Ligand binder design. Structure first.
Ligand SMILES: CC(=O)N[C@@H]1[C@@H](O)[C@H](O[C@@H]2O[C@H](CO)[C@H](O)[C@H](O)[C@H]2O[C@@H]2O[C@@H](C)[C@@H](O)[C@@H](O)[C@@H]2O)[C@@H](CO)O[C@@H]1O
Ligand SMILES: [Ca+2]
Length: 143
């Protein structure tokens, strides 16, 4: 049940379309965060940090890909946790399948107030777009 106080990101798009980082902090499958693609683009590295309302014991991250485009779809991730928002500890690394299905990332129970998702790999419907974008309809945490 942890509440996301806020989501911050490496970057966000509010100019070419409305896709701020906070759109990834609700369960509307029809809104998403997009890394900044409009000039000047931020083309990586990409990440997203959820600040929880308290310290929780967490063992799972849910990731809902953007539903209308594969652009930015996360296929490689590192998950880290923090108590103070500054010092992070890696708890999980892995790949995710290249489809729009909801993903889960699971690890041993760990106390966190902040959960960071580093995008190590991402896909695109563009020929030379590997790694350029990051999108998320939702990122959430569970314990
Ligand atoms: C094959 C190919 O090159 N396709 C591109 C496609 O990737 C582009 O989509 C947009 O790309 C930017 C980043 O460059 C963002 O991801 C945009 O959200 C994305 O737009 C979305 O998809 C398109 C197809 C439209 O439905 C748009 O309204 C969506 O938001 C488009 C640019 O429109 O061009 C090529 O089709
Ligand atoms: Ca959403």
């Amino acid at each position: 049940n942890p509440r996301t106080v806020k989501i911050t990101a490496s970057s966000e798009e509010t100019s070419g379309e409305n896709a701020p980082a906070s759109f990834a902090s609700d369960g509307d499958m029809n809104t998403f965060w997009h890394s900044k693609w409009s000039s000047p683009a931020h083309e990586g590295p990409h990440h997203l940090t959820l600040e929880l309302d308290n310290v929780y014991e967490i063992n799972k991250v849910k990731y809902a890909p953007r539903q209308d485009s594969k652009n930015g779809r996360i296929t490689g991730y590192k998950v880290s946790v923090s108590l103070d928002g500054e010092n992070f500890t890696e708890v999980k690394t892995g790949t995710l399948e290249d489809n729009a299905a909801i993903k889960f990332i699971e690890f041993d129970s760990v106390d966190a107030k902040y959960v960071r998702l580093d995008v190590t790999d991402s896909v695109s419907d563009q020929a030379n777009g590997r790694g350029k974008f990051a999108t998320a309809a939702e990122v959430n945490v569970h314990g």
